[PDB]
Design a protein around this ligand. Structure first.
Ligand code: OCT
Ligand code: OCT
Ligand code: OCT
Ligand code: OCT
Ligand code: OCT
Ligand code: OCT
Ligand code: OCT
Ligand code: OCT
Ligand code: OCT
Ligand code: OCT
Ligand code: OCT
Ligand code: OCT
Ligand code: CA
Ligand code: CA
Ligand code: CA
Lengths: 403, 403, 403
């Protein structure tokens, strides 16, 4: 067949992507409760690259593809990854401008409130309809019939484990099967006089799993003293398949955070309440959902009993964060998170008071290239032996390039 | 080493490709004779993408590469494919303009009359010499020393099976080994006064398999009333390795088709005769060869006894097709195929009268983007229980983008 | 997220690469000592492609990636490779121009004197600092914490085997584990009046393996009669882990080569001395290191007893090469290598006199596209049965494109 110049063909195509290097080390003393989600890296060199292409195919049609490279070179003792790129997203977008509506069909990162919306977000295959007729307001309905589960491993509900009672692979939240996911969302962004108001409502029926419902409201000023306030409730009501088992509970999470910025300083204060004393519950579908703005620390919400994607235990946490930014370039800062998990089990496995301190540096070298580092210290008041405390420390150096 | 700008490097390069989505569902009632070639999709999302690059490397030399992505996301009950692209073709082309001759060497889609010439055509590694000294006439000689067999699965002769006699994997046409393939072809395209005449002659020796010979002639007018007439004979004579087994027969296929187009209407009428009553034979090497213009329906020639790439049974079929094209944009149409398979086996497995009706819609959204759909109904007069009939229905929705 | 035009994005990017086809056949008579490194190809079609991209990411920062395709289509009897591309190198380069210094971190081809610096060079992950403050002089320090070992197979020290004493997989140089590699180098290139002088010094500590030290000096005139002289010493001192085993010896290699070119003729003369009579030693880390300019022939230094990446036996070799270049386009030439291996083992396995003759053609079709061929004949005076000689012949046709 005929072939046209590559130079002509690329004119039709937009591109973006990410290149991320992490060097992670996570140590644990003997008494620490370990699990599939805590950082167990031993001086690993981790690379994650994604390149996204979007091509205007025909009038009102776009095709999108994402290639992903996800690899680790071991530091001490040691693999050196030999991997290629995989097609991580592949979809078609139809846009009818006359009614401000788009239909997105195929393998796509889901980007819902209960999944990670970043680099490593849950992917699935389905259809999404998005309407933007009302200025500031995005309305969406979606249906998903399969999930790219394997790539996520322990991030996905039902695929995480924890160590305890002579077993290394206790199932945090047992899921025998999963159905389609149907839902809808209303997401607002309104520029008001004093600042910007971002309310969201999300509803979703995940067949065989649960009915999920979430409401969030954020308000953010834009003047000297800038401040934000954000609150969220996420709950779910279990499907009968799980309800009949009597060892699960409906999910509830309440969260509130305030923050302030002035003269290069920033601080934040917040809290959250979630989980059940005696029964396994979940807040999100994958990892920490899109809840990053309402959490703090790095490792504490991965501790057994406190995970947001399946665990037993009632959690209450408060936190404060603060830092100073030199020259709008280098921010040095810290997080302190304190709280605990209440358990009804006689073992109280995962229970007790928990604390995390994190020292942070973030260096914005250019608008596209950011270097960062953290040192996280987590302390459990009750470890494997519950009458003794336990420490876990994690160090990360990261380079992050976006284009 | 030194590196030049990507922007300079791409000037040397031509590109083409295909993006195809299919949503297929194929149902079978209990009495239907199933096999490795009938459509057994259950609401599968199938993606096939190919991107071809050709670069002028030096005076008179081109290098070509094809990347292929071939993946399925399961609909009901469900995988979500995590696959990359593979190098499906990789070859060098030398062109001597002074004698209108080219030499093509390496891993290349074969594109012979006995293989599929489309997206999913048999690939092999070898050499091809093509001469175009005589206007309208292409002469070629070729030699192939290995085949990309695994990618083709049941499309390839010797790799198909059928269900029957308490067994799920009966071998349609047993091939213990295969040798090199040598052949030659003369392909004509002549613009005459009334229209265009396309005769072809193909000869090939496939060591350990058979000697293949095919002649085809097509004539196609170009005025109101436009019409085409095409006839073909394909035969083969088995190599001694198979001849000695006494359970195989030499292949013979005769085919004829006429078509007419007027005022947005089109119709076609044709027939074919192929196979042996009692012994296994073949017509093509892979799938349906390049015989698509001489067949109709979708699933009927995949029924056990009727496959063109290895089966037992003497087949006679007639068909008619027709449709109307609105606005040169949307064609609604239908196929009716009727005939049967004569078997000498006491079981008459695969035998009996067979029928297929297909309803079609084809929507040419742009010159490059085509949407299409079919609903196929196949009826066997003799099923697994031979004194009862059997139905098989297949629905496909397809989006096809070519560039 | 927002996406910019691909056409803009590529402006930031430099590219280079290689496309190589080899057709190799290596025959052995019954008495030949075979091993994991001799050419055992049977009319194999071998493809190796690499494409390298380097992008300016930010002020003073570059990111580099190499994609590799390494595949074989079998000739006689026969696979047809279905493989994609893998990320073979991935690294960041920081350059401070004020002090003529660069820091290179990540997965990178090592390119040290003890590894192949060509297409198939050892890759590892680590850090390199390179200083070019003194004109002509490059100073470097490096640290490597993991090796891409699997890709190299028998090229890597500790991963080669040989046939003998009723066993097919005798370990040439047994390595139970390997540590980090730290080293430094000083590499000079000085344009003097008469020509160019290229001295090198390399030092490296490979934990658990050995301390390596190498000095090389090359001198090359640039007038009628042009000539080169080059000498090298490479030695190593074994780490205690191997020293304690008493079956290994410290490495020593001495080499000298002279060459001359006049009126389209070229010739060279050289010699080398390396290895230990009774104990396993090595010269390089991977394949033949960067020693290609000090060797001749094709297969002789792969014979059991003579490998430069782990073997037992004391080797002494001399060689002469010569050829004529027609029109600065086609060189026809030959290599003759003669010597032997002294062994203290009662079997004298790998020992005896050894000879190689190679006939060569090299055709420079364009500056970027080179065709080449060789016919190599190797003769062992002592084969598997030591009182009988043994032959091994190897034919290669190659096409090589660089951009
Ligand atoms: C030459 C037409 C534009 C090509 C678009 C690329 C399709 C993935
Ligand atoms: C209406 C805003 C969401 C609910 C906030 C809950 C905070 C305790
Ligand atoms: C709107 C109040 C923000 C609270 C921030 C307090 C952090 C010390
Ligand atoms: C700042 C801490 C608030 C919540 C602590 C709960 C302690 C069990
Ligand atoms: C910069 C020269 C052209 C590059 C051709 C690409 C080779 C695959
Ligand atoms: C000469 C044309 C090919 C043979 C046609 C056979 C149709 C019955
Ligand atoms: C040349 C005759 C064409 C026959 C078409 C008939 C279909 C009804
Ligand atoms: C239109 C039908 C022609 C061939 C039918 C053969 C029936 C066994
Ligand atoms: C559009 C900015 C340049 C892109 C560089 C490519 C990164 C791998
Ligand atoms: C000083 C140059 C390296 C040593 C040469 C050894 C040649 C026998
Ligand atoms: C400097 C002397 C070069 C020696 C070359 C001799 C080859 C016959
Ligand atoms: C030209 C040959 C020099 C070295 C030969 C050594 C013979 C054992
Ligand atoms: Ca994730
Ligand atoms: Ca096929
Ligand atoms: Ca190598």
């Amino acid at each position: 067949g005929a072939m046209g110049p590559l130079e002509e063909a690329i004119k039709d195509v937009d591109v973006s992507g990410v290149l991320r290097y992490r060097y992670d080390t996570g140590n644990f003393d003997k008494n620490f409760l370990n699990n599939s989600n805590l950082n167990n890296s031993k001086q690993d060199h981790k690379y994650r690259a994604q390149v996204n292409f979007s091509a205007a195919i025909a009038d009102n049609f776009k095709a999108f593809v994402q290639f992903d490279y996800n690899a680790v070179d071991g530091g001490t003792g040691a693999t050196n990854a030999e991997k290629g790129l995989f097609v991580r997203q592949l979809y078609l977008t139809y846009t009818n401008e006359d009614v401000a509506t788009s239909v997105i069909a195929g393998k796509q990162q889901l980007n819902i409130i209960w999944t990670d919306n970043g680099v490593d977000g849950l992917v699935g295959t389905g259809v999404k309809v998005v309407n933007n007729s009302i200025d500031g307001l995005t309305l969406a309905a979606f249906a998903v019939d399969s999930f790219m589960a394997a790539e996520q491993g322990s991030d996905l509900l039902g695929q995480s484990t924890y160590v305890g009672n002579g077993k290394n692979n206790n199932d945090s939240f047992k899921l025998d099967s999963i159905g389609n996911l149907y839902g809808a969302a209303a997401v607002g962004s309104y520029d008001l006089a004093g600042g910007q108001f971002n309310p969201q409502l999300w509803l979703a029926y995940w067949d065989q799993v649960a009915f999920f419902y979430a409401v969030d409201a954020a308000y953010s000023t834009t003047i000297g003293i800038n401040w934000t306030l954000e609150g969220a409730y996420l709950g779910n009501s279990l499907d009968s398949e799980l309800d009949d088992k009597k060892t699960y509970a409906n999910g509830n999470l309440f969260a509130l955070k305030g923050s302030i910025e002035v003269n290069g300083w920033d601080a934040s204060l917040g809290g959250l309440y979630y989980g059940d004393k005696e029964k396994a519950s979940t807040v999100v579908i994958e990892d920490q959902g899109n809840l990053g703005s309402l959490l703090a620390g790095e490792e504490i919400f991965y501790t057994t009993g406190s995970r947001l994607n399946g665990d037993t235990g009632r959690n209450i946490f408060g936190y404060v964060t603060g830092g100073y930014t030199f020259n709008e370039t280098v921010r040095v800062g810290a997080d302190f998170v304190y709280g605990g998990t209440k358990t009804e089990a006689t073992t109280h496995l995962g229970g007790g008071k928990k604390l995390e301190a994190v020292a942070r540096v973030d260096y914005k070298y250019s608008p596209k290239l950011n270097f960062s580092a953290f040192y996280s210290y987590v302390n459990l008041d009750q470890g494997v032996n519950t009458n003794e405390s336990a420490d876990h420390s994690t160090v990360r150096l990261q380079a992050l390039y976006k284009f």
